[PDB]
Each structure stands twice: as C-alpha cells, then as structure tokens.
Amino acid sequence: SSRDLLLKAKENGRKSLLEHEAKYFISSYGIPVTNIRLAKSEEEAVNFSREIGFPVVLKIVSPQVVHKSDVGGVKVNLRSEEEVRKAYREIIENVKRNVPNAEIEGILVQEFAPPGVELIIGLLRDPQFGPTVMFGLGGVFVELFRDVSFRVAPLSEQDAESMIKEVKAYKLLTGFRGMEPVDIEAIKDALIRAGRIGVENEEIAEMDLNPVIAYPKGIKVVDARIILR
C-alpha cells in the first residue's frame, strides 16, 4: 500500500516525504508525475536515464537539503549518457562542501519536463472546513498576485471546473500568443484526486504540487511536497 510511505516516514520521525516518495504517493492516486528513478550509484543514474529517456534531471535526495539549488544539488537538461555522469559527480561533490554531513538517500533521476503552462495545485487543512484544495497559475500569478481559487473537499466535477474558471489568469489555459490551449479536463481530474488525497489521508498536513505543467494533452507534476501531522 502507498500508505506504507506515510507510515515509514512517521516511524522514522520525519515531518515530510522526500521528493521521490511524494511523487510515488501522488502517482498512486492517478495524478501524473515526472517519470522517476532513485539512483544509488552514478552507474544506476545512467541506466535509469536510458530507461526514462533523455534529457534527464538530476537532484540530490536528502532530509538535510531542502534547497537543492543553493547547495549545487540540481542539474537540469542532461542530454546524454555522460552529461549525467559528470553532473552526478558535480552534485555529489558539491553537496559535501556546502553541507558535508548530509545523509544521501541517493540522487534522483528525473524526466525533463518540457515547457508549457505552469500550474499550482495545493491542499491545506482549514480549521472550519477541513481539507481544502487550492488552484492557481504558476510563477508570479500565485506567488506575487495571489490569484488563487479554493474548494472544500471532496471536489465534484462542478467544483473543479468552476474553480479553474474562477482564477484571473484563466485565459492562460485557453490559448494565447505562442501557446495552444491546455488539457482542462486533465487539470480538473488532478484537482479532484488531490481533494481525495486530503480527505482520505488524515496524516497529511498539506500538499503542494508545484510546479505542475499543463500541455495540450495531459499534465505532469514536476515537483511535489507533502507535509505530515
């Protein structure tokens, strides 16, 4: 059961899931995620990259590192078998100097998501209303303008559709200069399933699917944080 991930994390006194764990858990509910494998050697990294398909993304996986970018932990758009291999050593060595005593669970090998319309799908717990789903457009639209919609879970199709249509940046989904319309049904589906996650899993304090990239067909969660209670 996917709940084994939540149970394990709690048994080891962790307040959050690691990146790969969060994505496994997300995936098991039917929310599409970046294809991922946890590498335990630079050699596994090349193998998994060949499985997943180039280009790949390499991230360090560790409780001690929560900002991968500031510690040299993330290498993006690695196109070949050994672009990743040098990158592997750059991460692994970079981490020692900036935080030398960090636990390495491994280095996460990831699908390089192409560009699209970035989304945020949030889940929080409101004292009055319990698990509440949050939606908004990525980048400055949520972070700066706070253009966001809420629905209390469980979400009906009506709730999912209406909350998408609600945001001020909604037109970014229906086509504009240099960008085709994106799969709104796919977004609605992710919203509903996110609502289900909150309702069912009481030990999840909050969840943030950010960024989530929508394409003309389908969506893919690129990063996901899950906080436990």
Binding site: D126, P127, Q128, T132, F150, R151
Partner: peptide, 13 residues
C-alpha cells in the same frame, strides 16, 4: 471566525 476566501468558496458550494 476563519478564512475569508474559504468561507466564500464554501458558500458557493
């Protein structure tokens, strides 16, 4: 009382 934004959404639902 609670979240302004979430109350509004609950009223809608």
């Amino acid at each position: 009382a609670g979240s302004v934004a979430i109350y509004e959404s609950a009223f809608k639902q």
